């Protein structure tokens, strides 16, 4: 069972003895620190609040286990038994903490306050930063959601340019990252973040997370289609690739089906097997059930362009109203190897240069989508900005001489609309001057209870692209 007393960085165990004497309040905030990715999608805090922070999170047993662990971990007794006991006895194990946050799904420019944390009991001044570690892990769903949205922006731009519309945009980037992430828990979190922007996923773990913690009107938030892997093609034997292909597309004759085609020779597979030997099985398929040919190796751009040129000569190509080439509706391509935000851009631009519509292709991404990201990408960071000691509030901050990029904000913070309709973060309690209207943060957690929640449908709406929003 999860124990919040054992879910912090070790050194934080010793912090209650390092704050100024008579400190009654510690107030801290989270931002994606300023100075690509000029704006971030705020998503994932609600998961952490519900799974880890709400309700009775302290018991006599959890206190004793933490005590015994830290005794050996530090080779000394430095653990704050009395402080944790106080929470157990006074509040029945419910955290005396208030957290305020921007609504989930909101798209906010870098350098803005996203959430704030403070203790609501003066005895629990040390509690605010004890929970830094688990709250800061929100960097991950934020970063996945943000990077996934940036890829949607690229896809939207080129789909609109080459086709005249955005039909099917939300299925253009499929999550293939289940095997390439660091754990089962990470898989569920990351896949959910991607589903903020898209509807295609093979990372099943994401579905149950959204259903439990966020909720959608629809039965599931994400979808998949039948698809082969190398084992189901190569198992037939090297001389029987065609037999495998025929069996698979015949088994899945009335639903869309993806078939990895590069086991031995992608170009032969496209031109001779699909393009000649099995062509009669492809041209008979329905628009609702296309064959989706999947290259999976080689230079991504070069391979996509050559696959398209091959198919364009074996199948009847049309020219859409924008002047771009379009495969028949029973035949599509998915590129699911080497795809990240950089190569995605290079592929779609290269397709556009060669007059291929983005209608023809979809992308899959695994490691690039869910694993190749760090806290450093958006500079997600939690810092103390305000304390009260001897009854006096002081504005605190760090400001390292050799890195102005690491300077933190001062004092009590609030988030506001500017006269032009943008975001601004006010420091030093200046929000109380009321020159900038109401604070846009909401209390989302207070004294062990979740006080404000968002459905996954609301989050998706908040996270929409401006291009989509242009009705």
Ligand X SMILES: CC1=Nc2ccc(Cl)cc2S(=O)(=O)N1
The annotated binding site for beta-nicotinamide D-ribonucleotide is made up of 202, 294-296, 336-337, 367, 375
- Work out the angle between the directed axes of helices 341-353 and 300-314 (0-180°, nearest 10): 40
Beta strands in 33-71 (DSSP E): 39-41
Give min distance, CB of 391 to ligand X, in A. 30
Q: Which stretch binds a second copy (CB under 8 A): 103-111, 156-164, 403-411, 450-458?
A: 403-411
Work out what residue 220 binds among ligand X, a second copy, none; the CB cut-off runs from 5 to 8 Å by kind: a second copy
Binding residues for diphosphate: 179, 230, 294
Is residue 224 within the footprint of a second copy (CB under 8 A)?
yes
DSSP string for residues in 213-234:
HT--SSS-S-B---B--HHHHH
Q: What is d(CA 262, CA 270) in angstroms, rounded to the nearest whole number?
A: 9
Angle at 278 between CA 273 and CA 283, to 5 degrees: 125
Q: Which is nearer to ligand X, 42 or 140 (CB)?
A: 140
* Residue matched to tokens 């490691």: 367
Give min distance, CB of 467 to a second copy, in A. 27
Site of interaction with ligand X (CB under 6 A):
9-11, 171, 174, 176, 200, 202, 223-225, 227, 256, 258, 260, 290, 292, 294, 332, 334, 336, 362, 364, 366
Q: What is d(CA 44, CA 57) in angstroms, rounded to the nearest whole number?
A: 20
Residue 196, judged by CB atoms within 10 A of its CB (0-12, 13-18, 19+), counts as: buried
Which residue precedes each gap in the chain (C to N above 2.5 Å)?
35
Angle at 136 between CA 134 and CA 140, to 5 degrees: 105
User: Tokens in use for 453?
Assistant: 């929640």
Give min distance, CB of 133 to ligand X, in A. 9
In contact, 396 and 410? CB cutoff 8 Å: yes
Is residue 198 within the footprint of a second copy (CB under 8 A)?
no
Give min distance, CB of 366 to ligand X, in A. 6
Work out what residue 231 binds among ligand X, a second copy, none; the CB cut-off runs from 5 to 8 Å by kind: a second copy
Give min distance, CB of 132 to ligand X, in A. 10
Is residue 397 within the footprint of a second copy (CB under 8 A)?
yes
Give min distance, CB of 328 to ligand X, in A. 12
Member of 104, 202, 359, 427 binding a second copy (CB under 8 A): 202
Q: Which is nearer to a second copy, 158 or 456 (CB)?
A: 456
Q: What is d(CA 288, CA 327) in angstroms, rounded to the nearest whole number?
A: 14
Is residue 387 within the footprint of a second copy (CB under 8 A)?
yes
Give min distance, CB of 417 to ligand X, in A. 34
Residue 52 gets which letter from DSSP?
A: I
User: Tokens in use for 411?
Assistant: 């004092």
Considering only residues 323 through 382, tell me which ones interact with a second copy, judged by CB under 8 A: 366-367, 371-372, 374-376, 382
CA 395 to chain centre: 33
- Neighbour-count burial for 350-387, b at 16+ CB within 10 Å, e otherwise: ebbeeebbbbbbbbbbbbbbbbebeeebbbbbbbbbbb
User: Tokens in use for 205?
Assistant: 């773990």
Closest by CA to 256, choosing from 174, 161, 142, is 174
Give min distance, CB of 425 to a second copy, in A. 19
Q: What is d(CA 93, CA 95) in angstroms, rounded to the nearest whole number?
A: 6
Member of 20, 55, 168, 437 binding a second copy (CB under 8 A): 20
Q: Which is nearer to ligand X, 33 or 174 (CB)?
A: 174
Say how many C-beta atoms besides its own lie within 10 A of residue 115's C-beta.
Answer: 23
Give min distance, CB of 387 to ligand X, in A. 20
Is residue 190 within the footprint of a second copy (CB under 8 A)?
yes
Work out what residue 375 binds among ligand X, a second copy, none; the CB cut-off runs from 5 to 8 Å by kind: a second copy
Radius of gyration of the chain (CA): 26
In contact, 116 and 31? CB cutoff 8 Å: no
Work out what residue 8 binds among a second copy, ligand X, none; the CB cut-off runs from 5 to 8 Å by kind: a second copy
DSSP string for residues in 259-275:
EE--SS-HHHIIIIIII
Q: Which is nearer to ligand X, 248 or 413 (CB)?
A: 248
Member of 109, 111, 180, 393 binding a second copy (CB under 8 A): 180
Q: Residues binding a second copy: what is the number (CB under 8 A)?
A: 112
Is residue 222 within the footprint of a second copy (CB under 8 A)?
yes
Considering only residues 263 through 322, tell me which ones interact with a second copy, judged by CB under 8 A: 263-268, 296-299, 303
Q: Which stretch binds a second copy (CB under 8 A): 82-90, 236-244, 279-287, 314-322?
A: 236-244
Binding residues: 179, 202, 230, 294-296, 336-337, 367, 375
Is residue 247 within the footprint of a second copy (CB under 8 A)?
yes
Give min distance, CB of 222 to a second copy, in A. 7
Give φ, ψ of 447 to 5 degrees. 55, 45
Q: What is the number of residues in the chain?
A: 471
Considering only residues 415 through 454, tell me which ones interact with a second copy, judged by CB under 8 A: none
Member of 123, 229, 277, 428 binding a second copy (CB under 8 A): 229
């Amino acid at each position: 069972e999860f124990n919040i007393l054992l879910a912090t960085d070790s050194y934080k165990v010793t912090h209650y003895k390092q704050y100024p004497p008579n400190t009654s309040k510690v107030y801290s905030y989270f931002e994606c620190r300023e100075k690509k990715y000029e704006e971030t999608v705020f998503y994932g805090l609600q998961y952490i609040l519900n799974k880890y922070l709400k309700g009775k999170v302290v018991t006599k047993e959890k206190i004793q286990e933490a005590k015994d662990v830290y005794k050996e971990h530090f080779q000394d007794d430095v653990f704050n038994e009395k402080g944790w006991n106080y929470i157990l006895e006074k509040y029945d194990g419910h955290l005396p903490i208030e957290i305020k946050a921007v609504p989930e799904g909101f798209v906010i420019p870098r350098g803005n306050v996203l959430f704030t944390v403070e203790n609501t009991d003066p005895e629990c001044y040390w509690l605010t930063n004890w929970i830094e570690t688990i709250l800061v892990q929100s960097w991950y769903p934020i970063t996945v959601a943000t990077n996934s949205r940036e890829q949607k922006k690229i896809l939207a731009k080129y789909l609109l340019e080459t086709s005249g519309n955005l039909d099917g945009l939300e299925y253009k980037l499929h999550d293939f990252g289940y095997r390439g992430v660091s754990s089962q828990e990470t898989a569920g979190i990351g896949a959910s973040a991607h589903l903020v922007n898209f509807k295609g996923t093979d990372t099943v773990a994401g579905l149950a997370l959204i259903k439990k913690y966020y909720g959608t009107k629809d039965p599931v938030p994400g979808y998949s289609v039948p698809a082969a892997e190398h084992s189901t093609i190569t198992a037939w034997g090297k001389d029987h690739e065609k037999d495998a292909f025929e069996h698979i597309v015949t088994q899945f004759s009335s639903v869309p089906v993806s078939v990895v085609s590069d086991s031995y020779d992608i170009y032969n597979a496209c031109e001779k097997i699909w393009g000649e030997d099995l062509r009669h099985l492809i041209v008979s398929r329905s628009t609702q059930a296309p064959l989706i040919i999947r290259p999976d190796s080689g230079n991504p751009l070069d391979t996509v362009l050559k696959v398209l040129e091959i198919l364009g000569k074996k199948f009847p190509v049309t020219e859409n109203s924008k002047g771009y080439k379009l495969l028949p509706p029973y035949l599509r391509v998915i590129q699911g190897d080497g795809v990240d935000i950089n190569t995605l851009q290079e592929i779609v631009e290269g397709m556009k240069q060669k007059m291929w519509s983005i209608e023809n292709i979809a992308f899959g991404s695994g490691g690039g989508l869910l694993q190749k990201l760090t806290r450093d990408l958006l500079n997600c960071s939690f810092k103390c900005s305000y304390v009260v000691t001897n009854g006096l509030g002081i504005n605190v901050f760090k400001d390292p001489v050799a890195d102005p990029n690491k300077r933190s904000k001062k004092g009590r913070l609030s988030l506001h609309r500017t006269p032009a309709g943008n975001f601004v973060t006010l420091e030093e309690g200046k929000g109380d001057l009321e020159e900038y209207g109401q604070d846009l943060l909401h209390t989302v957690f207070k004294n062990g209870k979740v006080t404000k929640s968002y459905s996954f449908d609301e989050i998706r709406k908040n996270a929409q692209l401006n291009i989509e929003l242009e009705a």
